[PDB]
Design a protein around this ligand. Structure first.
Ligand SMILES: *[C@@H]1O[C@H](CO)[C@@H](O[C@@H]2O[C@H](CO)[C@@H](O[C@@H]3O[C@H](CO)[C@@H](O)[C@H](O)[C@@H]3O)[C@H](O)[C@H]2NC(C)=O)[C@H](O)[C@H]1NC(C)=O
Ligand SMILES: *[C@@H]1O[C@H](CO)[C@@H](O[C@@H]2O[C@H](CO)[C@@H](O)[C@H](O)[C@H]2NC(C)=O)[C@H](O)[C@H]1NC(C)=O
Ligand SMILES: *[C@@H]1O[C@H](CO)[C@@H](O[C@@H]2O[C@H](CO)[C@@H](O)[C@H](O)[C@H]2NC(C)=O)[C@H](O)[C@H]1NC(C)=O
Ligand SMILES: *[C@@H]1O[C@H](CO)[C@@H](O)[C@H](O)[C@H]1NC(C)=O
Ligand SMILES: *[C@@H]1O[C@H](CO)[C@@H](O)[C@H](O)[C@H]1NC(C)=O
Ligand SMILES: *[C@@H]1O[C@H](CO)[C@@H](O)[C@H](O)[C@H]1NC(C)=O
Ligand SMILES: *[C@@H]1O[C@H](CO)[C@@H](O)[C@H](O)[C@H]1NC(C)=O
Lengths: 438, 48, 129, 48, 48, 96, 48
């Protein structure tokens, strides 16, 4: 209408938090092919030795796969620790909040004097909802010789040569690295926060969305309280049917399902008279027992080759996920790369990271408009001697019958100046004529 | 009341004291087939 | 209590026997599988012996039920460790013999030590303005 | 095992008389083929 | 049927694969629709 | 099941238990989403075009390459014609 | 007939396992392609 368009500009805002779990690791499954195929039976171990290298091939592929997981976990930890510099005066028992923003739940014990307690309250709350973490597997296997009347399938799997090994770095070490990477944004030298105080980094990031600094530095308390309310909403959100927690549990569940299917392959007959080597060897002598056992050996070795091929395929997806998580640590947490929907959806302010079972959990904080004003805006003006001006991260508006600028993400009329303008030596067509400006 | 027997596959459920509480004739109906496929009396919500 | 007069064998869903009632004494027993497992042996080319880890086994169980040995032993977090000195207070930044959960075997004898591949850079500057 | 077909029918083959016997009671469909076997559900008629 | 879980494994892997495709197609559609705001006055039969 | 004398391999595959299922969203829905994402650059609020008119976004993007604004806002008709000629060249290039 | 049919069952089950392993491998490339297409929608179409 004339030179102006109707736009809804936000008149009020809040900060919202969004969780994102990214898988970076998986349970290190290891199979003893000889114990799985033949159990304790010498007559089977003899026949299996005439198959030659097949167990050596299965072991070699699984050792390569597990070496890829170990190398990936090291590269993720290296990415978390890269460039982190902390003061030796730092003591998380006293130093936990700054500029009205509270980090106490995101920060564990710092330094070796507290031992393995370096897990934060946030990470504790996340790990307590997942039984089969690394320490969960170590405790389950520790109980297999406890004499318990409970028949844990993990014990039956391990006695059939199917076992999950712990990762080369414990989750308590990774939780120490995510704690250190978090406090590196909180206090000088601010090595993870572009070398400035965290609240100023938040303020400049919100200003970069097209919000005038004048509202930000007067609303600083409201911004800090919106921020730590968003963090509390993320923490409380794990008590509901949370999609990140569902994803973490799905990693454990898919592993446990695959191991259970591999154990169930021992009970298939594969066209032999029985699936039990005890029954065959107690019914037949070597000339016929050989013919039956050879059917079981082919069935079980085929099941191992199928499981190996699925495991290789899955670990390719784990490497892809870990490469994405390292990219988000670099370009959302340690810095703010100019990529729109990379660090979660919407007007991304800043991101933080915490440890999680088999991965990392990112918290993405976004500028969320609460209410809007419809206003008439000009995308440019033609002024004085037909010099063109265009607004930086904003619009020109009529206010009190006078041309004024406003930021695009928050309605606040302010005077037009070279601070908020791009100049052009000729104004374009359909720029609104304003000879009286400047 | 009399009915013919034949050789059939059943799902059987035994309780914590070894009584058969429920059974499913696997080929008798589509829902019986889902119950036998999942080895459960109440299958999960899904498309089979 | 579940064995009726005509019943003497307890089966699992896979058709393994997991319990029985003795026909002569009427006594009832659960049956459990005998322990089966691997040894994780760490070896260094400059060494004359292995460091052995019995994953998830306590040394009392290994000695009483598997095998006696002359080698020194201790209960690590991962299980019973033979022929390596317990030095988890010590730490190494690189490790060829990675056992899991931030534990490493190192060779001079073997040592069992913590693996800490990454450090924070420390400065003694004030945190406060 | 030897099980009934779920969703097939039972037949109530019991007959109660008072004095006269019908010659139709001793023919098909009452006289019935055994094949593999039969499952019976029988009411215990508790008189006093 | 004496090969037991072989067909169950084939069906389970293909159902996982097809679930990965479905989840991927949803994530692509979400990415297209993310942040899109249109005027209700918009009618492509006249504005093009 | 149309009774046709044509022996389609897809029918033989399906009768041997090999079948392609449809995706959970139809390609018509996806083409609706790409249409919505396209018109989001045409008109206010310009939610896909950085909140400015499409022609101004094109002009600023060309200026960012090291082209003076003076020739761009003078040649706007020539730039728009080059743009829709490029779009026609893509459409016609599908026939090759 | 059992001895012959068991060779066909092993052949056909082996072919299904090979086709499954190929399908898993291909769908990993489809996920990689979809992740790139979402990145191009975000960083070329919706923004520069
Ligand atoms: C600017 O400088 C001042 C002074 O250094 C900072 O003020 C301090 O801010 C913390 C919050 O981060 C205040 O802590 C509060 O203490 C009360 C108990 O007294 C407690 O109930 C609250 O939950 C909270 O922990 C602290 O009292 C306050 N100190 C003073 C002397 O005012 C301020 O944070 C700096 N930054 C900004 C943006 O203002
Ligand atoms: C073991 O249990 C069996 C079965 O209950 C016992 O045999 C029964 O004993 C009673 C009492 O003497 C008799 O009335 C039954 O006829 C016996 N036979 C059966 C088949 O029930 C048996 O006595 C028990 N033995 C021991 C040593 O406990
Ligand atoms: C293995 O060595 C470690 C390190 O010396 C021992 O851990 C210490 O044990 C004492 C006594 O319980 C404690 O006071 C220390 O705080 C422990 N230090 C740490 C780092 O945990 C450990 O007890 C030894 N274990 C065995 C079985 O020899
Ligand atoms: C902005 O929204 C919050 C929550 O509704 C409210 O407390 C605050 O007063 C609002 N401020 C303005 C300027 O509308
Ligand atoms: C292991 O066994 C102990 C003693 O029975 C028990 O307290 C603990 O909860 C068990 N843990 C697991 C994971 O089974
Ligand atoms: C890490 O810190 C410890 C303790 O100061 C030191 O012994 C070790 O050499 C350091 N390693 C690296 C790689 O900085
Ligand atoms: C910090 O370390 C340097 C080098 O050891 C030393 O000169 C300086 O006095 C130290 N300052 C404090 C406060 O410890």
């Amino acid at each position: 209408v004339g030179g102006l368009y109707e736009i809804k500009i936000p008149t009020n805002f809040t900060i919202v938090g969004q969780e994102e779990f990214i898988q970076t690791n998986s349970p290190k499954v290891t199979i003893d092919c000889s114990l799985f195929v033949c159990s304790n039976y010498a007559a089977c171990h003899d026949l299996l030795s005439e198959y030659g290298t097949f167990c050596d091939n299965i072991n070699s592929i699984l050792d390569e796969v597990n070496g890829l997981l170990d190398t990936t976990q090291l590269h993720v930890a290296d990415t978390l620790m890269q460039g982190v510099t902390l003061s030796s005066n730092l003591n998380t028992n006293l130093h936990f909040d700054v500029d009205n923003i509270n980090f106490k739940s995101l920060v564990g014990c710092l330094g070796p004097h507290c031992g393995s307690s370096s897990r934060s309250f946030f990470e504790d709350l996340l790990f307590d909802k997942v039984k089969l973490s690394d320490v969960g597997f170590v405790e389950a296997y520790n109980n297999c010789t406890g004499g318990s009347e409970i028949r844990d399938l993990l014990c039956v799997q391990s006695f059939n040569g199917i076992k999950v090994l712990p990762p080369i770095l414990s989750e308590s070490q990774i939780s120490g690295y995510t704690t250190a990477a978090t406090v590196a944004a909180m206090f000088p030298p601010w090595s993870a926060a572009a070398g400035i105080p965290f609240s100023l980094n938040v303020q400049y990031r919100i200003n970069g969305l097209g919000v005038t600094m004048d509202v930000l530095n007067k609303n600083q308390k409201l911004i800090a309280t919106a921020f730590n309310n968003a963090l509390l909403s993320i923490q409380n959100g794990f008590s509901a049917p949370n999609s990140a927690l569902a994803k973490i549990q799905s990693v454990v569940n898919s592993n446990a399902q695959a191991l259970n299917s591999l154990l169930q392959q021992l009970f298939n007959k594969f066209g032999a008279i029985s699936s039990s080597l005890q029954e065959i060897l107690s019914r037949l002598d070597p000339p016929e027992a050989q013919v039956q056992i050879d059917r079981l050996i082919n069935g079980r070795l085929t099941a191992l080759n199928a499981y190996v091929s699925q495991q290789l395929s899955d670990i390719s997806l784990v490497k892809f996920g870990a490469a994405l998580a390292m990219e988000k640590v670099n370009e959302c947490v340690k810095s703010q790369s100019p990529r729109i929907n990379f660090c979660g959806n919407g007007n991304h302010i800043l991101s933080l990271v915490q440890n999680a079972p088999y991965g990392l959990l990112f918290m993405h904080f976004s500028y969320k408009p609460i209410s809007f004003k419809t206003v008439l805006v000009s995308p440019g003006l033609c002024i004085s001697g037909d010099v063109g001006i265009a607004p930086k991260q904003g619009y020109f508006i009529k206010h009190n019958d006078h041309w004024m600028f406003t930021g695009s993400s928050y309605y606040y009329p302010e005077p037009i100046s070279d601070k908020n303008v791009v100049f052009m030596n000729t104004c374009s067509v359909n720029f609104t004529k304003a000879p009286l400006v400047y | 009341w009399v009915t013919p027997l034949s050789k059939r596959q059943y799902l059987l459920k035994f309780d914590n004291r070894g009584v058969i509480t429920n059974a499913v004739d696997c080929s008798s109906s589509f829902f019986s087939e889902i119950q036998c496929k999942t080895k459960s009396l109440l299958p999960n919500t899904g498309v089979y | 209590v579940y064995y009726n007069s005509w019943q003497n064998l307890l089966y699992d869903s896979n058709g393994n026997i997991i319990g029985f009632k003795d026909f002569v004494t009427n006594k009832t027993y659960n049956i459990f599988p005998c322990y089966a497992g691997r040894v994780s042996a760490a070896f260094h080319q400059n060494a004359s012996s292995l460091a052995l880890l019995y994953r998830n086994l306590k040394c009392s169980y290994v000695l009483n039920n598997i095998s006696l040995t002359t080698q020194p032993y201790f209960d690590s977090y991962l299980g019973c460790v033979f022929n390596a000195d317990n030095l988890t207070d010590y730490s190494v930044s690189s490790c060829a013999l990675r056992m899991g959960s931030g534990f490493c075997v190192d060779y001079n004898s073997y040592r069992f030590v913590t693996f800490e591949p990454f450090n924070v850079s420390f400065v003694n500057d004030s945190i406060e303005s | 095992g030897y099980f009934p077909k779920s969703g097939a029918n039972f037949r109530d083959l019991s007959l109660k008389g008072t004095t006269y016997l019908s010659t139709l009671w001793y023919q098909k469909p009452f006289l019935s083929d055994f094949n593999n076997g039969i499952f019976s559900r029988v009411k215990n008629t508790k008189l006093y």
